[PDB]
Design a protein around this nucleic acid. Structure first.
Ligand code: ZN
Ligand code: ZN
Lengths: 640, 640
RNA sequence: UCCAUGCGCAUGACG
RNA sequence: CGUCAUGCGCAUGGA
RNA sequence: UCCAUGCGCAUGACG
RNA sequence: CGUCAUGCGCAUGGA
């Protein structure tokens, strides 16, 4: 396994047992450097005939799969055992056994963290860093806070301090493994001065217990040989603002801010909370409606107003369906007022919609851009909805199709934001098409920025964040941060070893003590653990919905209300298991058909709590917030 | 009937009316334990002078025959009545009468299940678990899902819950029988942790309504006295891959995966389905051809390429015969292209075939192995075709004959996979020869693994799955699973009785409610039951083949088309009742000469459906999938 | 004893 | 939920 | 392969 | 400390 010279120089310190960091520009193939380090370390242990283990940690499963497929296994098919562990891949043997075998391991951090926790717990599945003899970490820049990498390494730091104390006062010391570190760039965060950036670098080193940073400052020639611009370009709004002012007058609400900013939205949420604490109308409901209107304004500021019309149409059609279902099996004055205030203008609002806008300007830019050019293209943005809007809008246009510009959307897989997520398989398929060429342009929020193997891209356009385009100053600050980070690395590399040791030791002690106080506060957090001390009410209509003892739990994850008395209250809806709404139209939850039972599961976000101590109402957004515990459902009862 | 001490201890709880499980290592003769339990129970009932019945259930007919021949009858020839019931043995008296007589019964589960269903139905042949006073089950580990054992025992669980309700609210309770359970090992399935294995064990106990598990933890000495290693060792491929790439280019097909994996085959099947939904060529036909090529690649990866040549030769010779028959009484461009692309290389492909391979390596291993050694040998594999290939190939070699190694193939009897099945009689004969010694080595897929009485085997080789050999990590996971299962049993045995009762009760309720939802969904499945609403077309050539009313049914099992108009379409073929093919060469079905009528029976796999509602085309693979029903043939019509 | 057909079930691998 | 392989069981019919 | 749920983490903007 | 957006990871369950 031949190694490049610039790679060779940086790798040399690690071959001597030094736990260091190794940061190289993207495209330099530092993965092969890690493979060489691994092979050399395992050969050294073979010569010494000792436990040779490596645990490669990557924050994304895609990276573990790629490393198994391309770099580690092919180069080590013959000598050693390898396994591409991950959480999504179903294995048949537990993790401790994988440690007892499979000399070389590619995994994901939180799996190892879970195994360590189980060791600390009573699950009896044990594993310790002492078992491993070397640890390799990818994207070390994420080891800056209580993330998984730092959570793993803090245990190692604590054990190292205990080992120092034992050494000084005792003969035996628990062995600890070597620690390698890889990263495209150490990064700088919340830095305004060289001093702050240097403090950040020292913090990263202390978290990784590194000895020194390593870069290539002598063989830059072939590196530059292998590794190789900012361009910048209504009546519907005021009509909607008029409606907003009218509803404010109807509600006697003082915004204190303008329309189309996070300040107004935050105030709306705060007033919604207050209204829920008062059990009053025209405040909570109007708070939600103003939230929706402000969202419409914000999207219109960057997206065609047709999409704001679609958003409002979906919202009010859902409201109509809710009220119609309520009528089955009357309407409040507030609901009547708001719905009539909307519907009376919906048709004319749409009429305004078609009238011609950052969108048209961006179109004018990109159509001109595509005349130059194989062709490739990328677009960045913020919201998931914006991606769908741009995709369908560019599909509607005929000029792009005439040029042959085929575009497709791309987003993450998180189940949030009330948008259809994209699965990992679909992301893989889309990227494969992009490589093949079935799609000429990509629209991504942040996925294509890192992780996804997107390359040979001529155009990269950022819309509201190798030609580079930024449609809408941030590039200047980004370049300044890059330069400051490089200078900080240069300084830190050139430092007295003892001063560096003292500083990193102080930082390690600080981190450990902070974690100790975090543990103390977390333990002190939950203290009540009461069976039934509350009552749940509908936040819109301050009516009794549930008691504290009639609730039960399934899977220790879902909370349900089995009592027949409760079932006479809610209503069911479904369109395209089923959704559960109030008598007032407020959503309550979902009908889960689990274990041969039709459990009406409910969510806490949409209810309000009333303690038996008459304490003020509260909103939680999550069950775990309160410390009181509920009993687990017993199927013997209700079996019937 | 003397009983061994370790057997005595485990059997003791059952003598007190406890429904338990009894798992002992193979070779400990737990059958005699069951016989002792049966004799004691029947003697106890004789003393009480009540209905003494036992229904022994075994999942294989061979086991029932062996129990009748060796263990139950010989030990109970004198006192009680016994009968070796099975589905293959022709009896003269129905099953309910056998219950009314024949105190002790050895049978197979699905026979009892059929009788219970008839009781539930209107056939008037009745039988109930209340009739029996004891139930004995062999290989209880199969009672984990909706298999026959669990399907029988769920009725018992439901009846037990009804009995508890009656007891609490009423005086009388329907009697229920004792339940014994035998198994070599409870087994662990889909378990990665002690918790999951324990959950599996509890599920098995709930399905069997066991009181406790029982093992021998005190008399292990004589058990170990009576009851008593992993070894591990081209241009044709690329030539065929070149042809595959060429045909892909001819078809504009994007595989998205590599060659020689189930992914490519699954994609080929999906694209075949899509093509059938489009009624287009070069997609379905090429899908089948690529299926065959991928199968050839997979078998070549583990088998000599000569067998891949044989497979392709059979396929293309059958195609030539089909096209020649079509010419009797033209060829498509796609068929011409593919057949010419194959034949032009067949001779040179064979020339490559003889050029020297897991096969030669395995030969080198086994020839060396046979120098040690009465001699015995076993080989395991996956495919039925691999067994025939290995048998004929080892026959071709002269070294094995020189050593005196005689080998024979062995497979199951299922009528699937397009391979010649092996009959039960032939399996018995082969095993008898193996015991006698006419054959020194056996080649089996999975039959010899369990059920078949194969023993005193020095060598057991697994090729792509008391010396043990594994030619090609799974042994490690198997040992881990064994250890985890043993620990789970140890834990479950040592548990509070009331907690165990509560957990098993919850599991029983869960299983019953799940079955209730299954029944609901099955009832809701079929709703249409229409006489004629579809048309059948040939999937290759999207041409009308049959209407919905011209079809008729015989035996409520076969669907035929009596209309003369249909007969003018198809063609007949036969080589070595007859087979029916299309005008395009597509296979349609078989000519069944039944009840003095030459019915042209057809299969649904090879046709495509077109609803009268213009719904999209569909593929079913089975008639029962659609709910619409067809009329039964009336012989008065067509009698002529 | 052999042959043909239909239905159901479980295991393993893969997606 | 789908694909492949393997094994098993039951129910019909014929020689 | 798809769907639902829960939990945790980081980044950016804002207050 | 709170709000919004984005992305990621893990753990359950079902088809
Ligand atoms: Zn309400
Ligand atoms: Zn045809």
């Amino acid at each position: 396994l031949q190694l490049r010279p610039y790679q060779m120089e940086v790798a040399q310190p690690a071959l001597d047992g030094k736990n260091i960091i190794i940061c190289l520009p993207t495209g330099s193939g530092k993965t092969r450097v890690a493979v060489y380090i691994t092979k050399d370390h395992l050969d050294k242990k073979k010569q010494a005939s000792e436990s040779g283990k490596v645990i490669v940690l990557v924050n994304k499963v895609m990276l573990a799969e790629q490393l198994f497929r391309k770099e580690f296994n092919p180069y080590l098919k013959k000598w050693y055992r390898i396994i591409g562990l991950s959480g999504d891949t179903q294995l048949k043997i537990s993790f401790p056994e994988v440690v007892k075998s499979y000399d070389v391991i590619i995994s994901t951090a939180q799996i190892l963290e879970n195994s360590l926790l189980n060791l600390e717990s009573g699950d009896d599945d044990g594993v310790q860093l002492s078992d491993f003899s070397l640890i390799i970490i990818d994207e070390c820049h994420h080891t800056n806070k209580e993330a998984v990498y730092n959570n793993i390494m803090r245990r190692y730091l604590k054990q190292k301090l205990r080992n120092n104390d034992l050494k000084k006062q005792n003969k035996p010391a628990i062995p600890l493994p070597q620690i390698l570190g890889l990263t495209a760039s150490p990064g700088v965060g919340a830095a305004k001065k060289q001093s702050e950036a240097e403090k950040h670098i020292l913090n990263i080193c202390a978290n990784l217990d590194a000895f020194t940073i390593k870069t290539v400052k002598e063989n830059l020639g072939q590196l530059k040989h292998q590794i190789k611009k900012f361009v910048i370009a209504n009546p519907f709004k005021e009509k909607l603002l008029e409606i907003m002012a009218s509803i404010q007058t109807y509600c006697q609400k003082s915004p204190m801010s303008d329309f189309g900013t996070q300040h107004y939205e935050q105030w709306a949420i705060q007033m919604e909370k207050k209204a829920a604490k008062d059990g009053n109308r025209k405040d909570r409901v109007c708070a939600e409606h103003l939230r929706k209107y402000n969202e419409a304004l914000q999207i219109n500021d960057t997206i065609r107003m047709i999409d704001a019309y679609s958003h409002l149409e979906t919202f009010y059609t859902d409201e109509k369906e809710k009220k119609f279902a309520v009528l089955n099996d009357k309407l409040d004055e507030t609901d009547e007022f708001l719905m009539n205030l909307f519907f009376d203008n919906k048709k004319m609002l749409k009429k305004l919609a078609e009238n011609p806008e950052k969108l048209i300007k961006l179109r004018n830019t990109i159509l001109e851009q595509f005349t130059r050019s194989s062709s490739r293209g990328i677009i960045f943005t913020k919201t998931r909805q914006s991606t769908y809007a741009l995709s369908q809008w560019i599909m509607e246009n005929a000029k792009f199709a005439e040029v042959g510009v085929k575009a497709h959307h791309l987003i993450g897989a998180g189940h949030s934001s009330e948008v259809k997520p994209m699965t990992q398989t679909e992301q893989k398929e889309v990227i494969s098409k992009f490589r093949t060429g079935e799609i000429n342009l990509l629209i991504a929020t942040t996925v294509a920025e890192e992780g996804l193997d997107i390359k040979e891209c001529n155009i990269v356009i950022r819309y509201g964040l190798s030609t580079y385009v930024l449609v809408t100053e941030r590039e200047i600050v980004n370049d300044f941060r890059e330069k400051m980070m490089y200078k900080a690395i240069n300084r830190v590399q050139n430092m007295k070893p003892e001063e560096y040791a003292h500083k990193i030791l102080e930082l390690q002690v600080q981190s450990i003590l902070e974690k100790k106080m975090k543990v103390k506060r977390s333990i002190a957090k939950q203290y009540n653990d009461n069976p039934s001390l509350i009552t749940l009410l509908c936040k819109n209509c301050s009516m009794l919905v549930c008691s504290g003892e009639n609730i039960h739990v399934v899977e220790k994850m879902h909370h349900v209300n089995m009592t027949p008395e409760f079932k006479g209250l809610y209503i069911v809806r479904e369109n395209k298991n089923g959704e559960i709404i109030c008598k007032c139209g407020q959503a309550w939850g979902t009908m889960m058909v689990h274990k041969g039972l039709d459990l009406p599961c409910l969510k806490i976000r949409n209810f309000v709590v009333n303690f038996k101590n008459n304490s003020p109402k509260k909103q939680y957004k999550k069950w775990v917030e309160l410390p009181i515990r509920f009993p687990d459902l017993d199927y013997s009862e209700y079996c019937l």
